Amino acid sequence: GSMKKVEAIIRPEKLEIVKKALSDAGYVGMTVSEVKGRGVQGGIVERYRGREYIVDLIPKVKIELVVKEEDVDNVIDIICENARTGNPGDGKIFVIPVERVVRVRTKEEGKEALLEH
Amino acid sequence: GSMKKVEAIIRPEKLEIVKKALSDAGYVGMTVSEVKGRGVQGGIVERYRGREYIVDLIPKVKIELVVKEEDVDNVIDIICENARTGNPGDGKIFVIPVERVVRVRTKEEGKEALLEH
Amino acid sequence: GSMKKVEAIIRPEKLEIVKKALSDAGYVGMTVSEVKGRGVQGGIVERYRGREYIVDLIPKVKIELVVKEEDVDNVIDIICENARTGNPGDGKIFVIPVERVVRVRTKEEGKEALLEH
Numbered sequence: 001g002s003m004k005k006v007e008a009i010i011r012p013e014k015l016e017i018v019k020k021a022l023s024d025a026g027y028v029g030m031t032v033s034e035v036k037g038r039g040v041q042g043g044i045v046e047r048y049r050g051r052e053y054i055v056d057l058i059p060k061v062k063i064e065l066v067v068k069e070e071d072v073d074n075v076i077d078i079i080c081e082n083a084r085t086g087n088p089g090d091g092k093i094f095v096i097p098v099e100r101v102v103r104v105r106t107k108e109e110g111k112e113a114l115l116e117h
Numbered sequence: 118g119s120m121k122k123v124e125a126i127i128r129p130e131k132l133e134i135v136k137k138a139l140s141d142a143g144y145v146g147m148t149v150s151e152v153k154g155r156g157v158q159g160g161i162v163e164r165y166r167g168r169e170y171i172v173d174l175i176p177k178v179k180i181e182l183v184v185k186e187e188d189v190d191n192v193i194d195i196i197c198e199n200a201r202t203g204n205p206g207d208g209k210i211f212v213i214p215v216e217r218v219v220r221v222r223t224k225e226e227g228k229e230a231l232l233e234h
Numbered sequence: 235g236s237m238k239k240v241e242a243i244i245r246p247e248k249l250e251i252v253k254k255a256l257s258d259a260g261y262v263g264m265t266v267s268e269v270k271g272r273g274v275q276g277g278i279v280e281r282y283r284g285r286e287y288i289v290d291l292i293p294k295v296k297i298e299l300v301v302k303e304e305d306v307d308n309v310i311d312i313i314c315e316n317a318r319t320g321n322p323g324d325g326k327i328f329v330i331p332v333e334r335v336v337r338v339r340t341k342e343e344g345k346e347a348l349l350e351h
């Protein structure tokens with residue numbers, strides 16, 4: 001059993017609901033960073049606070065959740081269901097392998113470093 | 118696949134040139150974060166906005182681009198050519214495996230999640 | 235052999251002592267970011283500046299160091315020794331594979347891109 005990092009870039013105003021939904025499902029641990037970004041070119045022009053970010057990078061938030069591999073699909077599904085709005089700019093999710101996890105306080109590793117105690 | 122995350126740490130004043138050159142080559146999707154860092158020991162001491170940084174962490178920008186593996190060399194070439202100044206502190210690039218990519222709005226995955234409209 | 239990213243999330247007040255202990259041991263290259271986070275549910279409720287945090291995320295610092303795989307254990311040891319306090323919230327470390335490293339100034343790839351010249 002391996003571990004994975006789910007790295008989701010989502011709208012800043014979706015952070016609270018996504019983190020509630022993840023938490024309600026038992027995926028509590030997460031790290032969040034303020035970022036700016038753009039997605040693919042073309043199609044409907046992205047709007048943020050009232051029509052149009054044609055050239056500049058748009059505020060987003062990055063959520064990183066390290067989970068057991070078997071939980072990745074669950075986590076992605078919860079993020080997409082709760083983050084989406086139907087407009088361009090809703091977000092993108094990347095899954096990255098994590099070879100080791102260590103809890104700083106105790107030097108526990110692996111599965112136990114991810115478990116409620 | 119496969120997909121890769123190109124994570125480049127560059128000078129803050131090189132964001133605009135690098136973003137434009139990447140865009141002009143088709144690499145539009147990107148996530149940008151403000152960071153501070155140090156590189157290897159040695160090199161002329163870095164100044165930044167008038168202040169010398171003999172020991173302290175220096176402002177940088179992190180750019181993250183998830184791309185098809187076959188595009189990584191092109192992305193690297195573009196970043197190096199446009200980010201460089203010839204002085205120590207120009208940056209460093211890390212290539213990290215990505216096992217899955219999902220577009221939030223549509224649940225599209227893989228190559229389709231990187232494709233332009 | 236291979237290269238790894240050590241991604242450590244620690245308390246903001248521990249940045250100074252942890253970075254100095256790393257650089258004293260030769261692990262000078264690092265990228266630092268401001269983040270917020272939470273760990274696992276249960277047990278003692280995390281406190282920060284005089285209040286409990288449960289729904290709300292707590293300020294942390296992320297330190298990213300790309301090192302040789304054979305340096306990871308020592309890096310993790312230094313971080314844990316210096317970052318720990320024994321209270322909930324001390325931190326978590328993730329080890330992520332890095333397939334390629336490139337120095338922007340020179341285009342050097344691999345082992346040399348982590349070394350003083």
Ligand SMILES: Nc1ncnc2c1ncn2[C@@H]1O[C@H](COP(=O)(O)OP(=O)(O)OP(=O)(O)O)[C@@H](O)[C@H]1O
Pocket residue numbers: 009010036037038039040041058060087088089090091092146147148149181182183184220221222223230231
């Ligand atoms: N290939 C990528 N690499 C890195 N970050 C990306 C990439 N694609 C998107 N992002 C990040 O995700 C954010 C949201 O992207 P966005 O929702 O516009 O994706 P999209 O692929 O254009 O899909 P949509 O058509 O739904 O907009 C961007 O602002 C950026 O921060």
Ligand SMILES: Nc1ncnc2c1ncn2[C@@H]1O[C@H](COP(=O)(O)OP(=O)(O)OP(=O)(O)O)[C@@H](O)[C@H]1O
Pocket residue numbers: 126127152153154155156157158160175177204205206207208209263264265266298299300301337338339340347348349
């Ligand atoms: N091994 C590393 N791990 C994490 N981040 C690093 C590492 N090396 C460099 N960085 C980041 O890249 C930034 C730029 O590094 P820098 O350009 O000084 O690299 P260098 O290896 O010292 O090459 P140069 O000789 O051109 O200075 C740093 O300030 C830091 O943010």
Ligand SMILES: Nc1ncnc2c1ncn2[C@@H]1O[C@H](COP(=O)(O)OP(=O)(O)OP(=O)(O)O)[C@@H](O)[C@H]1O
Pocket residue numbers: 029030031032064065066067103104105106113114243244270271272273274275292294321322323324325326
């Ligand atoms: N599974 C995870 N995924 C992503 N980030 C995490 C995860 N768990 C913890 N973090 C990050 O590490 C920080 C510190 O977590 P914390 O020290 O509370 O871990 P813990 O597992 O609850 O251990 P402790 O019992 O020692 O508190 C969090 O605020 C968050 O930034």
Ligand SMILES: [Cl-]
Pocket residue numbers: 254
């Ligand atoms: Cl000291």
Ligand SMILES: [Cl-]
Pocket residue numbers: 100306307329
């Ligand atoms: Cl290890």
Ligand SMILES: [Cl-]
Pocket residue numbers: 096213330
């Ligand atoms: Cl990563």
Ligand SMILES: [Cl-]
Pocket residue numbers: 156157262263347348349
């Ligand atoms: Cl280095």
Ligand SMILES: [Mg+2]
Pocket residue numbers: 038039040046088089090
């Ligand atoms: Mg888009």
Ligand SMILES: [Mg+2]
Pocket residue numbers: 155156157159160205206207
């Ligand atoms: Mg340097």
Ligand SMILES: [Mg+2]
Pocket residue numbers: 272273274280322323324
């Ligand atoms: Mg905790």
